[model samples]
Target: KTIRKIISSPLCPKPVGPYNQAILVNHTLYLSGILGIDVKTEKLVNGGAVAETRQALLNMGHILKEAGSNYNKVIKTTIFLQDINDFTDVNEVYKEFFKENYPARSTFQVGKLPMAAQLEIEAIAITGEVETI
Candidate 1:
């Protein structure tokens, strides 16, 4: 049989538009771009890009947990930023979450984002154990 599941967590902010937080097909999990909105407030977290980046990754962690995965299982990620100058700030917090087995990543400076967010992050991860060599 085939398997496909929508992954969602109440601890993470709900999608504001037509999209699930993540989708699990077979053993792979595909996370959608997540903003730094707080789940309780449903608004973008304050501070700036660095703060947003941290919250965004934290939100991703919840989605990954819902999908039976974690940062270590993530193989790839894409980051979208409203300003390119925030790269170093974003990296500082990014390293905090993904310390080891760093996932492949791509970053793009976009002109704008919904809710006027500073950044968004998305990821792909394996649902089961992986052999790291």
Candidate 2:
């Protein structure tokens, strides 16, 4: 692992296990799993699929910002959900954040999640490059 940096944020919940909020390897920023938990309370949000999906992506956005990146820079992502049937509901909210040039993504159901979150998301983003003249 050519780790260049370990990222974190106050806007996101503390990882339940041993892991940074994200890591910068070379120039690529890999974000940790983000849940739909409230920033202040760190509790799973309400409103079922709609609320959870939005919050997870929103939380990921903050970490991306902290790492000098944003949703536009994301190249790929993986979404984990407790209910595969909620795909439509998740998509409605997901399309809002990534309205343009959305990256390649894989979303599917999971067995369980920490804190009983309905969904969780992780992302890999580019941090541009150093063009040496």
- Model 2 pairs whose backbones collide: none
Q: Give the per-residue Cα lDDT of candidate 2 at 13.
A: 81
lDDT per residue, candidate 2, 44-133, as tens digits?
788887899998988888898888888878889898999999998998998888866688999999999878888888889987653323
lDDT values of the candidates? 0.91, 0.85
lDDT of each residue in 1-133, candidate 1, tens digit only = 8799999899899877899999999999989899998887889889999889989988889999989999999989999999999999999999999989999999999989989999999899999878889
RMSD of each: 0.9, 3.1
Runs off by more than 4 Å, candidate 1: none
Residue 80 displacement in candidate 2 (angstroms)? 0.7
Clashes of each: 0, 0
In Å, residue 32's CA in model 1 sits off its true spot by 0.7
Give candidate 2 regions above 4 Å deviation. Answer: 1-3, 129-133
